[PDB]
Coordinates of C-alpha atoms in Angstrom, one line a residue:
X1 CA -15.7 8.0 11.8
X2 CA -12.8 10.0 10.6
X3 CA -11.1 9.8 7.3
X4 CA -8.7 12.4 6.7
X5 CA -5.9 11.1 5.3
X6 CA -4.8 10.9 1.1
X7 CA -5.8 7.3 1.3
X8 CA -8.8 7.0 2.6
X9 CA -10.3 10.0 1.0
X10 CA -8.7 8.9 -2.1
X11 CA -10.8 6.3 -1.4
X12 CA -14.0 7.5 -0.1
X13 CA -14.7 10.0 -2.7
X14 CA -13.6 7.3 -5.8
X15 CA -16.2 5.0 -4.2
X16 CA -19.0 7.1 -3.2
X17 CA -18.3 10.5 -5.0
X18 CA -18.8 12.9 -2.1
X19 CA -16.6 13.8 0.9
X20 CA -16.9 11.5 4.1
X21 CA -19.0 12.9 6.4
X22 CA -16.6 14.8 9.0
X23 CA -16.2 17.6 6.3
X24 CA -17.4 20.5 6.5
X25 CA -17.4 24.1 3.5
X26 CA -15.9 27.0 5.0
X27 CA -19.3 28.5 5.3
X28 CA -20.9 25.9 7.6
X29 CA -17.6 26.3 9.4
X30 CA -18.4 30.4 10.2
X31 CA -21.8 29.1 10.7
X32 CA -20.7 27.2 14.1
X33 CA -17.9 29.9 15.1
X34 CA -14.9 29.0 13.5
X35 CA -12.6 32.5 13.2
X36 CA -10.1 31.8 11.4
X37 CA -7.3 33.9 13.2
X38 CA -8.1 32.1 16.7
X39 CA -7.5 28.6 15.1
X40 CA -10.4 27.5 16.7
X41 CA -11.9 25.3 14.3
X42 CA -11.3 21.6 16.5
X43 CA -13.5 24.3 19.5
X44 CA -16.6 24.8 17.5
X45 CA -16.5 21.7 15.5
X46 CA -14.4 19.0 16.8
X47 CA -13.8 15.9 14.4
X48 CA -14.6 18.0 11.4
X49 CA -12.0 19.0 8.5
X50 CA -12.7 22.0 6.2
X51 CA -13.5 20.5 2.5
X52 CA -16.1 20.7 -0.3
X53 CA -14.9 24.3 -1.5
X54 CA -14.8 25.2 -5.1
X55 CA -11.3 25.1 -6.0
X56 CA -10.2 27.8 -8.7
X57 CA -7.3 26.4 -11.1
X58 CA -7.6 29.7 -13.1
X59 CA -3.4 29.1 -13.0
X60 CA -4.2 26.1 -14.6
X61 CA -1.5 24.1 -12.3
X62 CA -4.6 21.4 -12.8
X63 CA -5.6 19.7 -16.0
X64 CA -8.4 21.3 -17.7
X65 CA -11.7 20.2 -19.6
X66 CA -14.3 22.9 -20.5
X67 CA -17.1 21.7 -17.7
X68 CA -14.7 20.1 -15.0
X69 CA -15.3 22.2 -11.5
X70 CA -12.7 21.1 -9.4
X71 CA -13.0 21.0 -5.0
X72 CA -10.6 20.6 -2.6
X73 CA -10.5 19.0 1.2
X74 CA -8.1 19.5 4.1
X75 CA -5.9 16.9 4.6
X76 CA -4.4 15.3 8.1
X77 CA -6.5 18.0 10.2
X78 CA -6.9 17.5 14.1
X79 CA -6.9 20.9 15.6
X80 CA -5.4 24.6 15.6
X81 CA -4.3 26.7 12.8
X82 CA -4.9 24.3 8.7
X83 CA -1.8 22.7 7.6
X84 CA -0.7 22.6 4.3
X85 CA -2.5 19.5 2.9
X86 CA -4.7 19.4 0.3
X87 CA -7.1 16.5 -1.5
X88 CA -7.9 18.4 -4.9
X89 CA -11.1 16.4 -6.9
X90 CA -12.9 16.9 -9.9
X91 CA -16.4 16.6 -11.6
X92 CA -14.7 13.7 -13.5
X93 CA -13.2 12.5 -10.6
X94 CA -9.4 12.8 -10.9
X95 CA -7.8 13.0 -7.7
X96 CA -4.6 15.1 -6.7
X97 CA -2.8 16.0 -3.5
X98 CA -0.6 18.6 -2.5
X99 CA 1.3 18.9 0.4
X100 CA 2.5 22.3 0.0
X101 CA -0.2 25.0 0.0
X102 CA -0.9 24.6 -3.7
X103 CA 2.5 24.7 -4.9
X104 CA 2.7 21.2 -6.1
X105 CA 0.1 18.5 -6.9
X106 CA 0.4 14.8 -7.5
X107 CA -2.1 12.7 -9.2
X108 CA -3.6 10.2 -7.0
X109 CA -6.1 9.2 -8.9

């Protein structure tokens, strides 16, 4: 019921090509009540992660094609305030992680 780790969604998303099903986009997050500077997201939606987001790359810290979009997932969420992990996939699906707020990424996949 819950994958949230580098591993699994690794996993999950090379396998079936869309986020496990305890993800939710910021959107649908504020759509159930989630405010951001209470931390309450684990209140309003417990068991769900934020993930499905365009991700921007306009840094180009990402490869580049002309056409690849790329997303990104929260990684190792429970509850309170997001943490610093991040599950970055493309169109193509390569697969990167960063454990440091976008400062770093590692290919995964």
């Amino acid at each position: 019921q819950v994958i949230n780790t580098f591993d699994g969604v690794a996993d999950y998303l090379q396998t079936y090509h869309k986020l496990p099903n305890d993800y939710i986009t910021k959107s649908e997050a504020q759509a159930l009540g989630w405010v951001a500077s209470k931390g309450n997201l684990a209140d309003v939606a417990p068991g769900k992660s934020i993930g499905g987001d365009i991700f921007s790359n306009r840094e180009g810290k990402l490869p580049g094609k002309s056409g690849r979009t790329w997303r990104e997932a929260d990684i190792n969420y429970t509850s309170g305030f997001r943490n610093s992990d991040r599950i970055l996939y493309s169109s193509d699906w390569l697969i990167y992680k960063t454990t440091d707020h976008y400062q770093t990424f590692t290919k995964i996949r």
